[PDB]
Amino acid sequence: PPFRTFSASDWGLTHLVVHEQTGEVYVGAVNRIYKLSGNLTLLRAHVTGPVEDNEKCYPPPSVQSCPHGLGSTDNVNKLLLLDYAANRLLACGSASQGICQFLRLDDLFKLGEPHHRKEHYLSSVQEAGSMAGVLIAGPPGQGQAKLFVGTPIDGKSEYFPTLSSRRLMANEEDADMFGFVYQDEFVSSQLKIPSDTLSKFPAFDIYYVYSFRSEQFVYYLTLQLDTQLTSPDAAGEHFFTSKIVRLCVDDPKFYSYVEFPIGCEQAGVEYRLVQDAYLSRPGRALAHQLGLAEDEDVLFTVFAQGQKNRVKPPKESALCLFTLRAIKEKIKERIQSCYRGEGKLSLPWLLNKELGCINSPLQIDDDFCGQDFNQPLGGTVTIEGTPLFVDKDDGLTAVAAYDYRGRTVVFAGTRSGRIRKILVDLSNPGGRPALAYESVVAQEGSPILRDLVLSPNHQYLYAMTEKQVTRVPVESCVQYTSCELCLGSRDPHCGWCVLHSICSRRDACERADEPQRFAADLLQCVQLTVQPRNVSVTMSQVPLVLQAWNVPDLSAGVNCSFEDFTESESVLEDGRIHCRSPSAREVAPITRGQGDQRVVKLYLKSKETGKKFASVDFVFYNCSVHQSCLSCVNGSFPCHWCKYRHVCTHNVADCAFLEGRVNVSEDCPQ
């Protein structure tokens, strides 16, 4: 069937998110904020630009006068999140130093847009995709909600923090919105880049890709400019280095900060340029394969080769895997290694002067949220990842995943606009851990954007490009017509509903829990055999006996349908299906014309469904047309040559005399 489509205006899209319950689709974009419905039908929208502003205006002209001017410029939506507790939506733009609006859920009514404080502004960058974060509501009923936000600052370190823990009041008009959850004379739930570090390398910055809540913490995948591999001259050879970061939800002074490099390799190829990430529960399959508990989560990642460029990395990309276990371990290992006095905190950009690790007798837990020394703590060894798939022709751009009845499925967007469906398994008799079993095309010629989430019923995945969104069905099982290639494609959702003769999902096959109703393994397609397989046109209604294999309890009833000429009703005994061959009256127009023999499909039509599902080849033949003694005998099937009548027939009473019976080729006359 065709692809559900939603085009865009004259500009471009940036962010999407789905209400976990209503399945509605909120879409962030330049100047606009579209809200769609379950089938990508355009609903409500909300306009936010262009506005009169200059990037050089701190504060924006809408609060205090500015020299250097202004001019109408586009307001790119950089971040977009849902506040389920307060039933609203936060869409942060790039205009007027990046204020944020609060659109009420059910009509996008501008509930507020606080735009007059210093900490009401977030960043003056014009690029999108560099901001990310999550919300954390406190105890319900008690109107506070925390919100952890990271963004680049383009060297404007006095104005905007690069990472904070601001507050969310229930009343949007309030001026305490977006205020830091802990404020004192020196440390705040903040993290400004030192004016020193920008003095070494001018436009150093932290770009923030993904962010997810896990246990009682929040993690970020950042990408910073390398303080080592880059000379102070900021020409165009500047290299970058990807690093994870982690905080506590309950850490007001921001002592728990921690930062480890990430990457992976396969066949000696380096991958250290992060692109996208998705936090998923791995499903019972990959869980027991990896040793993880049923509540422990996993993070899929996408790294580009090398450390250069970044604004347009090279195509070669890899889909690597990091376990939440191995990360809580490398953390409790670097902060256990510190609270022992070994090494030193190693954040060359945040600390400048190499403070050393301090000894301490405190014994670290899994839930240790830092103390006033040995923080913020750096990363010494680059965390290495497990490669699942590499592609060199058509680059990878986005990722997502989920589980199906144990199995672990990975969806990956491409720069060409396709979305490959990946199955990950380590015990595959190939060694290799991932197979690209499909390549749906959502829109040729447009890179997929990194936002790529499923509907609540996990049935569809909304795939957004710059130009349009495309509701692609996960279970695209219908395209396959026969058991032989429905299960041979290796789609984990697809099995063959044997009695309905269709390739579909498991719960869509009626009564599929009873034995022999759904088809799992390739060596289990329906098989039918006939005794006898061949009969001469001279015979009529001879009783056949058929043995069907891998079929359910057919006591519901089954018919013998000879293509579309007869519909004999059958009887069932033990494991065999008895029914009658056609009468030669039915057979007559069938062989009228063909010549030597004709094969016909013996189907099994079930009474429960009414549709034919099992096939087997059945053959008729007519010994008459054969002209010589060798034409008769050497034919495969049992034909008798009547040497005295000079004809070829079946039933030997047809010969001139018995002694005219010629069965074998050697009894031919010369």
Ligand X SMILES: *[C@@H]1O[C@H](CO)[C@@H](O)[C@H](O)[C@H]1NC(C)=O
Q: For binding to ligand X (CB under 6 A), which residues are involved?
A: 37, 39, 41, 531-534, 636-637
The DSSP output letter for 506 is: G
Distance CA 260, CA 383 (A): 7
**Closest distance of CB 536 from ligand X, Å:** 10
Beta strands 617-621 and 534-536, pairing class: parallel
Identify residues after which the chain is interrupted (C–N over 2.5 A). none
Least distance in angstroms from the C-beta of 534 to ligand X: 4
Residues 6+ apart with CB under 8 A from 52: 61, 70, 71, 72
Amino acid at the residue 325: R
Q: How far is the CB of 39 from ligand X (least distance, A)?
A: 4
Our CA dihedral for 489, 494, 495, 501, rounded to 10 degrees, sits at -90
> In three state form, how does the secondary structure of 166-216 look?
EEECCCCCCCCCCCECCCCCCCCCCCCCCHHHHHHCCCCCEEEEEEEEECC
State the Cα–Cα distance between residues 629 and 633, nearest whole angstrom. 6
Name the token pair of 538: 């001279």
Q: How many Å apart are CA 80 and CA 27, to the nearest integer?
A: 8
Three-state SS for 304?
Answer: strand
d(CA 11, CA 26): 17
Q: In terms of CB distance, is 179 or 532 closer to ligand X?
A: 532
Between CA 584 and CA 320 the distance in angstroms is 66
Closest distance of CB 52 from ligand X, Å: 37
Q: Where are the alpha helices (DSSP H) in 502-619?
A: 584-591
In angstroms, give the least distance from the CB of 546 to ligand X.
Answer: 11
CB atoms within 10 A of CB 415: 17
Alpha-carbon span 208 to 316, nearest angstrom: 21
Pull the structure tokens for residue 327.
């990360």
Q: Which is nearer to ligand X, 382 or 468 (CB)?
A: 468
Task: Report the alpha-carbon distance of residue 469 to residue 17 in Å, rounded.
Answer: 12
Least Å distance, CB 596 to ligand X, is: 13
- Closest contact distance (angstroms) between CB of 629 and ligand X is 18
Cβ distance to ligand X smaller for residue 531 or 651: 531
Least separation in angstroms between CB 41 and ligand X: 4
Nearer CB in complex with ligand X: 3/182: 3
| 105 vs 262 by CB, closer to ligand X | 105
DSSP letter, residue 32: B
One-character DSSP codes across 53-73: --TT-SS-TTTS--SS---EE
CB of 654 to ligand X, least distance (A): 19
Q: Which is nearer to ligand X, 294 or 617 (CB)?
A: 617
Please identify which residue in the block is written with the tokens 């005794």: 531
Check if the beta carbon of residue 497 is closer than 8 Å to that of residue 512.
yes
Return the number of the residue (423 or 537) whose C-beta is nearest ligand X. Answer: 537
CA atoms within 13 A on the CB side of 513: 1
Q: Which two tokens stand for residue 10?
A: 């004259």
Residue 62 or 468: which CB sits closer to ligand X?
A: 468
Nearest CB to ligand X, comparing residues 213 and 533: 533
Q: In whole angstroms, give the CA distance from residue 185 to residue 150.
A: 22
Q: How far is the CB of 578 from ligand X (least distance, A)?
A: 15
Minimum separation from the CB atom of position 641 to ligand X (A): 16
Output 367 or 617, the one with its CB closest to ligand X.
617
Residue number with CB closer to ligand X (171 or 529): 529
Residues 6+ apart with CB under 8 A from 636: none
Q: Judge if the upstream peptide bond of residue 376 is cis by omega within 30 degrees of 0.
A: yes
Residues 6+ apart with CB under 8 A from 628: none
Which residues sit opposite 80 in a β-bridge? 91
Q: Provide DSSP, 359-373.
A: B------SS----SS
CA-CA distance, 80 to 108, in Å (whole number)?
Answer: 13
Q: Which residue lies nearer to ligand X by CB, 5 or 583?
A: 5
| C-beta of 195 vs 529, nearer to ligand X | 529
CA distances from 37 to 324, 368, 443, 455 (A): 34, 43, 20, 11
Q: Quote the least distance from Cβ 669 to ligand X, whole Å.
A: 24
Q: To the nearest whole angstrom, how small is the minimum distance from the Cβ of residue 637 to ligand X?
A: 4
Sheet holding 543-549, edge to edge: 527-531, 543-549, 576-580, 571-573
Q: How far is the CB of 593 from ligand X (least distance, A)?
A: 21
**CA–CA separation, 41 and 118 (whole Å):** 38
- Residue nearest ligand X, CB atom distance: 532
Closest to ligand X by CB, 25 or 135: 25
Q: Do the Cβ atoms of 163 and 104 come closer than 8 Å?
A: no
Token pair 């940036």 in the structure block, residue: 14
Toward ligand X, which CB reaches closer, 112 or 638? Answer: 638
Please, what is the minimum distance in Å from the beta carbon of residue 530 to ligand X?
Answer: 7
Identity of the residue, 9 or 531, whose beta carbon is nearer to ligand X in the bound complex = 531
Minimum distance from residue 615 beta carbon to ligand X (Å): 17
